[PDB]
Design a protein around this ligand. Sequence first.
Ligand SMILES: *[C@@H]1O[C@H](CO)[C@@H](O[C@@H]2O[C@H](CO)[C@@H](O)[C@H](O)[C@H]2NC(C)=O)[C@H](O)[C@H]1NC(C)=O
Ligand SMILES: *[C@@H]1O[C@H](CO)[C@@H](O)[C@H](O)[C@H]1NC(C)=O
Ligand SMILES: *[C@@H]1O[C@H](CO)[C@@H](O)[C@H](O)[C@H]1NC(C)=O
Ligand SMILES: *[C@@H]1O[C@H](CO)[C@@H](O)[C@H](O)[C@H]1NC(C)=O
Ligand SMILES: *[C@@H]1O[C@H](CO)[C@@H](O)[C@H](O)[C@H]1NC(C)=O
Lengths: 29, 238, 291, 50, 50
Amino acid sequence: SKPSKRSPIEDLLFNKVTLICAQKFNGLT
Amino acid sequence: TTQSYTNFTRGVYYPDKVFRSSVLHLTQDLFLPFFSNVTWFAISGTNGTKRFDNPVLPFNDGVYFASTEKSNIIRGWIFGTTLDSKTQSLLIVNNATNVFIKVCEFQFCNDPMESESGVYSSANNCTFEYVSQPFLMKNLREFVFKNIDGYFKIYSKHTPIIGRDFPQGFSALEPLVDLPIGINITRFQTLLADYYVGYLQPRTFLLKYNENGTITDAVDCALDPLSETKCTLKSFTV
Amino acid sequence: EKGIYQTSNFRVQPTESIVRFPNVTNLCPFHEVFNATRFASVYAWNRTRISNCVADYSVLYNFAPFFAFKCYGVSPTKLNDLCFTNVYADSFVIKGNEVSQIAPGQTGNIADYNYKLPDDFTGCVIAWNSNKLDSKHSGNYDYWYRSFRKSKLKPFERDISTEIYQAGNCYFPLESYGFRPTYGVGHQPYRVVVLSFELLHAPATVCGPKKSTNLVKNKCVNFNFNGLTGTGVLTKSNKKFLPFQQFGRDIVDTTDAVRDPQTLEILDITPCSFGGVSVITPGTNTSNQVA
Amino acid sequence: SNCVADYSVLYNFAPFFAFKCYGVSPTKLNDLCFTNVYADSFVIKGNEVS
Amino acid sequence: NTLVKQLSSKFGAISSVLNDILSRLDPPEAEVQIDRLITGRLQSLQTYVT
Ligand SMILES: *[C@@H]1O[C@H](CO)[C@@H](O[C@@H]2O[C@H](CO)[C@@H](O)[C@H](O)[C@H]2NC(C)=O)[C@H](O)[C@H]1NC(C)=O
Ligand SMILES: *[C@@H]1O[C@H](CO)[C@@H](O)[C@H](O)[C@H]1NC(C)=O
Ligand SMILES: *[C@@H]1O[C@H](CO)[C@@H](O)[C@H](O)[C@H]1NC(C)=O
Ligand SMILES: *[C@@H]1O[C@H](CO)[C@@H](O)[C@H](O)[C@H]1NC(C)=O
Ligand SMILES: *[C@@H]1O[C@H](CO)[C@@H](O)[C@H](O)[C@H]1NC(C)=O
């Protein structure tokens, strides 16, 4: 029923851990 | 006259023109240390307002000022080396329409019940004159006077309060003017017709910037092991 | 071989340069400081401040040929392209034989007792022989020396007061003198002006002459804002700068915003696009087509 | 050798054409102790002092 | 964050910004200041990669 088709536990794992490199964009990609 | 000394948490000013947002910036400059000995002067300090004798306090590499008053008796400031015409002195007078600043080799002339008189009877070997909006226009009217590399940097912050002599919260002083006087300014005295004087020391502070270009908090890195840890980690939460 | 190789990086180049300098048209009085018939004494040198003006340095070459014209923290040729925070002219007259003492790192009685320069010095030392102005048959009064000092001076300090030093015999505080047209060149006076230039990343009005151009937004451009030089894309800012601040920096102290010297608007700086370039090759022995 | 190396007398003696030290600063000479100090005295022309 | 922060260091140079060094100085002095910055930045990259 949810996008990414992950399990409830996987969603919890993804939400607990925190594309365009706006930061540090000085030749480092 | 002289009274309690060791309790001020205020005296932080924007050290430079660079705008910062949502960053904790660790910097070293001359600041009033937290909980430093700030002298409280008790109108006119030693003398009663009628009486002549004034403090003539020293200028120890920069001074923090405050004056929580409604009467504006202490509108003026005198800064100098000898204050006796042998060296130049800087005279700042707010006349309630503008602030008039000039520096000259002028002697002390016994400058100031409820009777005003003129001041500054002679202008010998003057260097420059400056005019700008009033420095002082209840109101804390806190100031920082720093003297380094020729420039005499004056910072200020205005805010009313009735129920306390000082707000308990954090405030930061913005630069008001930076004048190239070029003189030693070994000491200073104030002109009269609530008075606090503190002194700056070289210190490292962690300054908290808001989403906007304003400082909302600060940590004095040498005050306490907890403050030192906060400065080490670049965080207000340990 | 078949695979992906990173071979080079790409950048988007600027198409034009933007020069945005202050509105001030007042010319800096360098001519009046250099071009004079009376000069301050060495022990009491004249520090005159230059501010709120256009620092056009070509007039110094029109004024005279020089004995010495040496800058330490800046190149003379390019002086017209910089903006300075604090510019001071220290004017005095010294002998040719001691001109080399007015420099950072030097030791001598004139450097130590009257005019000491800092060792971390940025600025210019300008010397020009004044014999045609100062020479007198009866003897001039331009030389004023403090032969003996009780304690040596720190950088840019001055001490006017005169006292007699006692060995325990009497050393008089002032050695003053003139010279004749017949003295050798090494003994003739030279007018010396020290231009002390404090440069702090474009904070101030005094700039050399430049022809300002229009401000162009949303393009990769070169820019020079009161001497702050860089390449990037300028956009309208929504940052709430105080009247006090002129520049903004990000979390790593990289400049990301400026105030326009003529409009006082806040502009954001986005770097021009760049990145790696990778080449997808099927393999030379299969095809010469690549992506 | 076997003496107090007081260097202030050189400033009482004369002003100098040149007074330059290479491995030590002149001002601080009075704060050092030396293993071997030798004075090599000769007279040369100004044009070759350098 | 450390690798980026190292770009602001001077490493003995008059300035951390190459554009300012080239803007004020002639090639010779600029080359000296740039070599100081190259050495510092190269050391920062070598440490990061290690
Ligand atoms: C920064 O300054 C602005 C302007 O004074 C403050 O005001 C709010 O700004 C936000 C910006 O998204 C607006 O959405 C609000 O409507 C503004 N409220 C007002 C003007 O009453 C803003 O609060 C300041 N930042 C902080 C953290 O206080
Ligand atoms: C310092 O703190 C005390 C309370 O602990 C307070 O009474 C005092 O007013 C503070 N200092 C000053 C100068 O107000
Ligand atoms: C500069 O000096 C010359 C003489 O060398 C004089 O003719 C000229 O008027 C002077 N200019 C000023 C502005 O004093
Ligand atoms: C010294 O500088 C001041 C700056 O206002 C100038 O007016 C004065 O004429 C100068 N004097 C000399 C001798 O250069
Ligand atoms: C510069 O001059 C122009 C003249 O049209 C004026 O509009 C602008 O506001 C001026 N800017 C400053 C900063 O004085």
